[PDB]
Design a binder for this molecule. Structure first.
Ligand SMILES: CC(=O)O[C@H]1C(=O)[C@@]2(C)[C@H]([C@H](OC(=O)c3ccccc3)[C@]3(O)C[C@H](OC(=O)[C@H](O)[C@@H](NC(=O)c4ccccc4)c4ccccc4)C(C)=C1C3(C)C)[C@]1(OC(C)=O)CO[C@@H]1C[C@@H]2O
Ligand SMILES: Nc1nc2c(ncn2[C@@H]2O[C@H](COP(=O)(O)OP(=O)(O)OP(=O)(O)O)[C@@H](O)[C@H]2O)c(=O)[nH]1
Ligand SMILES: Nc1ncnc2c1ncn2[C@@H]1O[C@H](COP(=O)(O)OP(=O)(O)NP(=O)(O)O)[C@@H](O)[C@H]1O
Ligand SMILES: Nc1nc2c(ncn2[C@@H]2O[C@H](COP(=O)(O)OP(=O)(O)O)[C@@H](O)[C@H]2O)c(=O)[nH]1
Ligand SMILES: [Mg+2]
Ligand SMILES: [Mg+2]
Lengths: 397, 428, 426
C-alpha cells in the first residue's frame, strides 16, 4: 500500500550572507576630461557590463622576454572576468545606486534589519564622494540628492514620517584617527582655539567611556559608552553632521588633495515604536553603520611627509588588518582575530556576525592602476562566502 | 676610462674591505697612497696619494666606524665616508621609501663630485644584499635614480643570494622578490652568490671548517680583481665591460651569468698537484665548484666566457677549448653556434696576506649561462610563497606603503622570468 | 640610538637594580663616576644607554617610579644607588596596597605628570630615541598599575618608537598574596594593544634552574634576578656592540613577530652550567645550541617540547665561525623539524655579535617563541574564573570600583589571546 517518501535535513545558520556592490570611479568635471581623451574610455581595459555584472581588465599583451603582469590573455579573450552581484559605473547616479542598493534596503531596515556600509579601493578614488557627496544646485537644498548620508537622511524624514509612528532619530559620529575614538557632535569647547583661564582647571579632559563593552548576549554586537545621539526634527539640523564632516581629518597629497586622511564609524539607530494588533509594542530598530574609509595610499606614489607617514601607514594598517579578517572568514578559522584593530572589533557585528551589510568597491580606472585594483580584487573575489544570519527587532511585553 | 664602486648594506660594505685591500695590493698601496705609474678607481691628490672611487652607504653608524677608525681609514676620504642615522632594520619598505629618501640627496651629490672627475666613465658596480633591507631597499631606490642620471653607463651588481637551506633572517625571501623585479626593470647585469657552495669550497678546496665573512668574501674579492682590475692592464686579448653587453648577454634580459673560479688551492696542495691549462678548465665544469647551489647538467650552456690570468698560451688553450667540447656532458644550446669568448690577460692573481689560497700561475673566472639557476631561482621563491599564503610579516611594509598588488606583481613576473630561461632551447 | 629605562614594582625596581649592576660591570664603571674600562667598544658606543653633562659623574638615563620610599631608599642606601643622581627618583609617600586598581587608577594619578615631565626632561635631551625599557611586576600593583598607565601615555607621546617591557609572569608555586590573578589579568588589557612586545619570564621555572641545572642551594632574589639580568643585557648587544650579523631590536621585532599580537617571548641562556662542571666540559657551538632543545633551561615554566616553535632567535656572543655556526643551527632544524612551523622555512634567526661577555669566551642568548608559552596564562585565567564566582575579596577594589565589564573583557582578552597559538600550533 505504501511507498518511501525520503527526506532531507536543513541548516538554519543562515544563507543570506552578504551583498557585494562595485561602484567605481568615474563621471567628474575632471576625470572624463583625461580618461576618455587619450586613453580608452570609461572601462578601457575593464569592459563594463551591468546585467550579468561581469567585468574583465587587461593590459597590452605582447611577447615580453620577461613576461609582465596581465599577459595572461589569448588570441582574442577577456581575462580575470570578476563577475559580481551588481557592478556600477560612472553613469550610476545618486538616485540609481539608491534605487538598487540603498532605497530598497531602507524599507527593509525599518522593521529591525541592521546594516553596515563601507567602501574599499585605491586612494583618491571616491570613498568620500560615495558616502558624503555634495548637495546639488538648489536655492534651498531641502536635503537634496547627494552621497549616501543626506539622501538617507532625506528618507529619514520620509519613511519614518510615511510610517506615521513613534520614531526616534539617533545618530552618533565617532572619528577613527590613528585607532582612537573622537566625537565631533560634542560641544568641542576644548577642541576649538579658545583661551583657558589664568588658573587652569581643565586643560585636558579624558571623559568619554571609549572602551568596548562586550555583553556576550549574542556574539559580535558592539557596545560603547557615552555616545551622543542626534535628535533633529527636520533636515536643517544635519549641518552638525556637516560639522563632523568639516572637522574630519583630511590630507593634501600628490595622489589626491580631496582624499580624507582619517575615517569614521557613523552609526544609525532608527528607534521606531508602534503597537501591533496583538496589543504588543514593537521596537523596530534598524542600524545603518555608515562607515566611511580613507584611501589605501601608495605612500611612495604620493611622496608623503613624516607626519603624513604614520597617518598613511595606519590607514594602510587598518585596511591590511581588514584583509586579515577576510581570509579568516572564508577559510572558517576558529578564533578569527578581531582584537588587533578596534575597527575589526567594530566589525564583529557583521563580518561573521548576524545582520546584513554591503561592500562598495570604488577602484581606479587608469592603466597604471590595474594591479592596484588587483589588491582590491583580491578581497572582492573573497567577499562572497561570509556567513551571517539576519534578524529583525521587536519588543516583548 | 674609469670605474666607480658602490657599497650598500652591511653585506656590500664588508665586501670592499677585502676588495680594496686587494686593490691596495694591485699597486703596493700603503694607507697613504704610495704607488708608481693608473686611473680606473683612482683620483689623484697633489701628493700623489690616490683615493678610491668608492661609495659608502650605511644607514647605521656602526659598520663605517669599524672602517674609518680602523685600518685603511686615511685612504678613504670623508667625501666617501657617508653614513646614516638609523637603519631600515631589514626593511625593504624603509630602505626604498622611508629612510632611503634621507641620505639619497647626499650620495647622488657625491656622484656629481666624482663622475664629473671621470674622463670617459666606463661604468660602475653595486655591492649589496638580497636579504638586508638596506641592501634591498636602497638598491631599489638608487638604481632607478641612476638610470635617470646615467642611462648610458654600466650597472653591475655583485649581489649575495641566500641559500634555500642556510638562511640568517626570516624575511630574506620576502625581501628579494620585491627587490629584484624592480631591479630587472632597470639594472644592466646582476650576479648571484650563495654561501652554500662557498662553504663547499671551504671544505673541499680550502679544506677549512672555520671561515669568516672575510674569507667567504676574499674568494669573491679575488674574482672582481680578475673581472675588471686586469682590464686596464694588457695581456694577449684584453676585454672591457662593453664587450659583454650584447655579446655575453644575447638578449636585453638574460643578464644573469654564473661566475666560477677554478684554482682554489690550500697551501699544502701545491705538491699533490702540478697545475696546467687543461686541468683548471676541467675544474670549471664541476657541479661542485659552481659557487651557487646549482647543477649545470640539468640545464644548458647558452654562453661560456673564459677570462684568464697569468701565463697562458692560447694554443694550449685551443687544446682545452677543443677538449671540453669533446668531453662534454653539457647539453649545449641550439642558438649559440660556438661562441666561447676568450679573455687572456697577463697578470697572475695576487696572494692575500693572511689568506688561504696559494700562488697559482693561472686563474680562470668563467662566466657561463644556464637554466640550472632557474631552478635555484624558484627554490627561494617557494620560501616566499608560503609566507604570502599565511600573510605573515606583512604589517611592516604595508605600514610604509607596500601593496599586496606588488606581491601578485613581483612574484608572478619573477615566476614568469623563470619560465623565460626555458625559452632558450625551444625553437630549433 | 638611545634607550630610556623605567622601573616599577617591588620586584622590577630590584630586578632593574641588579641589571645596571651588570651594565656597570660591562663597561668598567665606577660607582662614583670615573671611567675605568679599557675597551674602545665600551667607550665608542656609550650613547646607547648613556647621558653626558659636566661633573665627572656617571649620570643615568634611569627614571625610577615607585610609591614606596624604603625600596628605592635601600637602592640608594646600597651601592649602585650613588651611581644615580637624585634628579630622577620620582615617587610618593603612599602605600598602593599592591593593587592594580590604585596605581593605575588613583594613587599613580598623583605622580603621572611628575614622571612624564622627567621623561620630557630626557626624551627632549635624547639625541635619537630608540628604546623605552620598562621593568615591573604582574603580581603586585605598583608593577602592574603604574606600568600600564605609562604605556597609555608614552605611546601617546611617541607612536613611532619601540615599546618593550620585561613583565614577570606570576608563579602558581611560590607566592604570599591572594589577589595575584588580578594584577596579571588586568595588566593584559593594556600590554596587548599598546606595547610593541613584552617578555614572559616566570619564577616558576627559575626555582628549578638555579637549584638543579646550576647546582645551587637556595633560589635567592639576588640571584634569581641575576639570571634574568644577564639575559636582559644580552638582548641588544648587536645594537650596542659590533657583530657580523648585527641584528636590530626592530629586526628582532620584525623577524620574531609574524603577527603583531603574538609578541610574547621567552629568553634562554646558553652556558647554564654549575661551577664544578667546567672541568667536565669543553665549550663549543653544539654546546651552546644544546640548550636550545632543553626544556629546563626555558626561563618560563613551559615545555618547549609540548607545543611547537613559531619563531626562534639565536643571538650569539663570541668569535665564532659561520660554517660551524650555520650548519649546527641547520642540524637543530633537521633534528626537530616537527617542533616548528611549515610556512616559515627559516625557523631560526641567527644573530652573531663579535664580543662575548667577560668571563666567558663563548656565549649566546636563546630567544624562542613557541606555542606552549600560552600555558602559564591558563594557570592564572582559571584562577581568575575561580576568583569571579564567589567574587572573593572584592571589598578591596569595590571602593575603587573597577567594572565587571572590564573584568569579563580581560578574560575575553585572555580567551582570544591564548587560543590563537593553537590555530598555528598544530
Ligand atoms: C670562576 C669564575 O669566574 O666562574 C664564572 C663561571 O664559571 C660560571 C659558573 C657563571 C657564574 O654565574 C653564576 O653562578 C650565576 C648564578 C645566578 C645568576 C647569574 C649567574 C659567575 O657568577 C658569572 C660570571 O660570568 C660573567 O661574568 C658573565 O660575563 C656574566 N656576568 C655577570 O653575570 C656579572 C655580573 C656582575 C658582576 C660580574 C659578573 C654575564 C653574562 C651575559 C651577559 C651579561 C653578563 C663568571 C666570570 C663566573 C661566576 C663568578 C661564577 C655562569 O653564569 C654566567 C651568567 O656567566 C653560570 O652559568 C655560567 C657558567 C660560568 O662558567
Ligand atoms: N657572504 C656574505 N654575506 C653576507 C655578509 N654580510 C651579510 N650577508 C648577507 O646579507 C644578508 C643581510 O644583509 P645585510 O647586508 O647584513 O643587511 P643590510 O643590507 O645592511 O640591511 P639591514 O638588514 O637593514 O641591516 C644576510 O642574510 C647575509 O646572508 C658577508 O659579510 N658575507
Ligand atoms: N563614481 C563617481 N561619480 C561621481 N564623482 C566621482 C566618482 N568617482 C570619483 N568621483 C570624483 O572624484 C573625486 C575624487 O575622489 P575623493 O573622494 O576625493 O577620494 P577618496 O577615494 O574618497 N579618498 P579618501 O577620502 O582618503 O577616502 C570625488 O570628489 C568625486 O568628485
Ligand atoms: N625574582 C623576584 N621576584 C620578586 C621579588 N620581589 C617580589 N617578586 C615577585 O613580584 C610579584 C609581586 O609583585 P611586587 O613587585 O612585589 O609588587 P608591586 O610593587 O605592587 O608591583 C610576585 O610574583 C613576587 O614573587 C624579588 O626580589 N625577586
Ligand atoms: Mg570619495
Ligand atoms: Mg642594513
Amino acid at each position: 500500500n505504501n511507498s518511501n517518501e525520503l527526506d532531507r535535513k536543513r541548516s538554519d545558520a543562515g544563507e543570506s550572507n552578504i551583498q557585494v556592490v562595485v561602484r567605481v570611479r568615474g563621471q567628474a568635471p575632471n576625470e572624463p576630461k583625461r580618461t576618455a581623451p587619450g586613453i580608452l574610455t570609461t572601462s578601457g581595459p575593464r569592459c563594463q557590463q551591468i546585467d550579468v555584472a561581469i567585468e574583465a581588465p587587461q593590459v597590452s599583451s605582447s611577447s615580453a622576454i620577461a613576461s609582465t603582469s596581465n599577459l595572461v590573455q589569448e588570441s582574442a579573450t577577456r581575462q580575470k572576468s570578476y563577475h559580481f552581484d551588481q557592478v556600477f559605473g560612472p553613469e550610476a547616479d545618486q538616485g540609481m545606486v539608491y534605487q538598487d542598493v540603498v532605497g530598497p534596503i531602507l524599507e527593509e531596515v525599518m522593521s529591525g534589519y541592521n546594516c553596515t556600509i563601507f567602501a574599499y579601493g585605491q586612494t583618491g578614488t571616491g570613498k568620500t564622494h560615495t558616502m558624503e557627496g555634495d548637495l546639488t544646485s538648489q536655492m534651498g537644498t531641502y536635503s537634496s540628492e547627494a552621497g549616501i548620508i543626506p539622501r538617507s537622511l532625506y528618507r529619514l524624514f520620509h519613511t519614518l514620517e510615511l510610517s506615521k509612528e513613534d520614531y526616534s532619530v539617533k545618530a552618533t559620529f565617532i572619528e577613527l584617527y590613528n585607532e582612537e575614538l573622537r566625537d565631533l557632535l560634542s560641544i568641542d569647547s576644548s577642541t576649538s582655539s579658545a583661551e583657558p583661564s589664568s588658573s587652569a582647571t581643565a586643560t585636558k579632559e579624558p571623559q568619554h567611556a571609549l572602551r568596548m563593552y562586550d555583553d556576550a548576549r549574542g556574539k559580535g554586537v558592539v557596545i560603547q559608552g557615552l555616545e551622543e545621539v542626534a535628535l533633529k526634527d527636520a533636515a536643517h539640523g544635519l549641518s552638525v553632521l556637516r560639522r563632523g564632516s568639516q572637522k574630519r581629518q583630511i590630507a593634501a597629497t600628490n595622489c589626491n588633495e580631496q582624499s580624507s586622511r582619517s575615517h569614521s564609524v557613523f552609526t544609525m539607530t532608527v528607534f521606531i515604536k508602534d503597537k501591533g494588533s496583538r496589543g504588543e509594542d514593537v521596537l523596530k530598530i534598524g542600524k545603518l553603520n555608515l562607515v566611511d574609509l580613507a584611501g589605501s595610499e601608495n605612500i611612495g606614489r604620493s611622496g608623503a611627509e613624516n607626519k603624513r607617514a604614520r597617518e598613511a601607514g595606519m590607514i594602510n594598517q587598518s585596511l591590511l588588518t581588514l584583509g586579515r579578517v577576510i581570509n579568516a572568514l572564508v577559510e572558517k578559522n576558529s578564533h578569527i582575530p578581531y582584537r588587533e584593530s578596534k575597527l575589526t572589533r567594530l566589525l564583529q557585528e557583521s563580518l561573521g556576525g548576524r545582520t546584513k551589510t554591503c561592500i562598495i568597491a570604488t577602484v581606479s580606472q587608469e592603466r597604471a592602476n590595474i594591479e592596484e585594483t588587483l589588491s582590491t580584487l583580491d578581497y572582492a573575489l573573497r567577499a562572497k562566502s561570509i556567513k551571517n544570519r539576519p534578524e529583525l527587532n521587536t519588543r516583548m511585553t | 676610462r674609469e670605474c666607480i664602486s658602490i657599497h650598500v648594506g652591511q653585506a656590500g660594505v664588508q665586501i670592499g674591505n677585502a676588495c680594496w685591500e686587494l686593490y691596495c695590493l694591485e699597486h703596493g698601496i700603503q694607507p697613504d697612497g704610495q704607488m708608481p705609474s693608473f686611473n680606473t678607481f683612482f683620483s689623484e691628490t697633489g701628493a700623489g696619494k690616490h683615493v678610491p672611487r668608492a661609495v659608502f652607504v650605511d644607514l647605521e653608524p656602526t659598520v663605517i666606524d669599524e672602517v674609518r677608525t680602523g685600518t685603511y681609514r686615511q685612504l678613504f676620504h670623508p667625501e666617501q665616508l657617508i653614513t646614516g642615522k638609523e637603519d631600515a632594520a631589514n626593511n625593504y619598505a624603509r630602505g626604498h621609501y622611508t629612510i632611503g629618501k634621507e641620505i639619497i640627496d647626499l650620495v647622488l651629490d657625491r656622484i656629481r663630485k666624482l663622475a664629473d672627475q671621470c674622463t670617459g666613465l666606463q661604468g660602475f658596480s653595486v655591492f649589496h644584499s638580497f636579504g638586508g633591507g638596506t641592501g634591498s631597499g636602497f638598491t631599489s631606490l638608487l638604481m632607478e635614480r641612476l638610470s635617470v642620471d646615467y642611462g648610458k653607463k654600466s650597472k653591475l651588481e655583485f649581489s649575495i643570494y641566500p641559500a634555500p637551506q642556510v638562511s640568517t633572517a626570516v624575511v630574506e625571501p620576502y625581501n628579494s622578490i620585491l627587490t629584484t623585479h624592480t631591479t630587472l626593470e632597470h639594472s644592466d647585469c646582476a650576479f648571484m652568490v650563495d654561501n652554500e657552495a662557498i662553504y663547499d669550497i671551504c671544505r673541499r678546496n680550502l679544506d677549512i671548517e672555520r671561515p669568516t665573512y672575510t674569507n667567504l668574501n676574499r674568494l669573491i674579492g679575488q674574482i672582481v680583481s680578475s673581472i675588471t682590475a686586469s682590464l686596464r692592464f694588457d695581456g694577449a686579448l684584453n676585454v672591457d665591460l662593453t664587450e659583454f653587453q650584447t655579446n655575453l648577454v644575447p638578449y636585453p634580459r638574460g643578464h644573469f651569468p654564473l661566475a666560477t673560479y677554478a684554482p682554489v688551492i690550500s697551501a699544502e696542495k701545491a705538491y699533490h698537484e702540478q697545475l696546467s691549462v687543461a686541468e683548471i678548465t676541467n675544474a670549471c665544469f664541476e657541479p661542485a665548484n659552481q659557487m651557487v647551489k646549482c647543477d649545470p647538467r640539468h640545464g644548458k650552456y647558452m654562453a661560456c666566457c673564459l677570462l684568464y690570468r697569468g701565463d697562458v698560451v692560447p694554443k694550449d688553450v685551443n687544446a682545452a677549448i677543443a677538449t671540453i667540447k669533446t668531453k662534454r656532458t653539457i647539453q649545449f644550446v641550439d642558438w649559440c653556434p660556438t661562441g666561447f669568448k676568450v679573455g687572456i690577460n697577463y697578470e697572475p692573481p695576487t696572494v692575500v696576506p693572511g689568506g688561504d689560497l696559494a700562488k697559482v700561475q693561472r686563474a680562470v673566472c668563467m662566466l657561463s649561462n644556464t637554466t640550472a639557476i632557474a631552478e635555484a631561482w624558484a627554490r627561494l621563491d617557494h620560501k616566499f610563497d608560503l609566507m604570502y599564503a599565511k600573510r605573515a610579516f606583512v604589517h611592516w611594509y604595508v605600514g610604509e606603503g607596500m601593496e599586496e598588488g606588488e606581491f601578485s606583481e613581483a612574484r608572478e613576473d619573477m615566476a614568469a622570468l623563470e619560465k623565460d630561461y626555458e625559452e632558450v632551447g625551444v625553437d630549433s | 640610538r638611545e634607550i630610556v629605562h623605567i622601573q616599577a614594582g617591588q620586584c622590577g625596581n630590584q630586578i632593574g637594580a641588579k641589571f645596571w649592576e651588570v651594565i656597570s660591570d660591562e663597561h668598567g664603571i665606577d660607582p662614583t663616576g670615573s671611567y675605568h674600562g679599557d675597551s674602545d667598544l665600551q667607550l665608542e658606543r656609550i650613547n646607547v644607554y648613556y647621558n653626558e653633562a659636566a661633573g665627572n659623574k656617571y649620570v643615568p638615563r634611569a627614571i625610577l617610579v615607585d610609591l614606596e620610599p624604603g625600596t628605592m631608599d635601600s637602592v640608594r642606601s646600597g651601592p649602585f644607588g650613588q651611581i644615580f643622581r637624585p634628579d630622577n627618583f620620582v615617587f610618593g609617600q603612599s602605600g598602593a596596597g599592591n593593587n592594580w586598581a590604585k596605581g593605575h587608577y588613583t594613587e599613580g594619578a598623583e605622580l603621572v605628570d611628575s614622571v612624564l615631565d622627567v621623561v620630557r626632561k630626557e626624551s627632549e635631551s635624547c639625541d635619537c630615541l630608540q628604546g623605552f625599557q620598562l621593568t615591573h611586576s604582574l603580581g603586585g600593583g605598583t608593577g602592574s598599575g603604574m606600568g600600564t598607565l605609562l604605556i597609555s601615555k608614552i605611546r601617546e607621546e611617541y607612536p613611532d618608537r619601540i615599546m618593550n617591557t620585561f613583565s614577570v609572569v606570576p608563579s602558581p608555586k611560590v607566592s604570599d598574596t591572594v589577589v595575584e590573578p588580578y594584577n596579571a589579568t588586568l595588566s593584559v588589557h593594556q600590554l596587548v594593544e599598546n606595547t610593541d612586545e613584552t617578555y614572559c619570564i616566570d619564577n616558576e621555572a627559575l626555582y628549578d634552574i638555579c637549584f638543579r641545572t646550576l647546582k645551587l642551594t637556595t633560589p635567592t632574589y639576588g640571584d634569581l634576578n641575576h639570571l634574568v639580568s644577564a639575559t636582559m643585557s644580552g638582548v641588544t648587544t648587536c645594537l650596542r656592540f659590533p657583530g657580523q650579523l648585527n641584528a636590530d631590536l626592530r629586526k628582532l621585532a620584525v623577524n620574531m613577530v609574524p603577527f603583531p599580537r603574538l609578541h610574547f617571548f621567552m629568553p634562554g641562556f646558553a652556558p647554564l652550567t654549575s661551577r664544578g662542571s667546567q672541568q667536565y666540559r669543553a665549550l663549543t657551538v653544539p654546546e651552546l645550541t644544546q640548550q636550545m632543545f632543553d626544556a629546563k633551561n626555558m626561563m618560563a615554566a613551559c615545555d618547549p617540547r609540548h607545543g611547537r616553535y613559531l619563531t626562534v632567535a639565536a643571538v650569539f656572543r663570541g668569535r665564532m665561525s659561520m660554517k660551524e655556526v650555520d650548519e649546527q643551527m641547520l642540524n637543530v632544524q633537521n633534528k626537530n623539524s616537527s617542533y616548528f612551523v611549515e610556512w616559515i622555512p627559516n625557523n631560526v634567526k641567527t644573530a652573531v655579535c663579535d664580543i662575548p661577555p667577560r668571563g666567558l669566551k663563548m656565549s649566546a642568548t636563546f630567544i624562542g617563541n613557541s606555542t606552549a608559552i600560552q600555558e602559564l596564562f591558563k594557570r592564572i585565567s582559571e584562577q581568575f574564573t575561580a576568583m569571579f564566582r564567589r567574587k572573593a575579596f572584592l571589598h578591596w577594589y569595590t571602593g575603587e570600583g573597577m567594572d565587571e565589564m572590564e573584568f569579563t573583557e580581560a578574560e575575553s582578552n585572555m580567551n582570544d589571546l591564548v587560543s590563537e597559538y593553537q590555530q598555528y600550533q598544530d
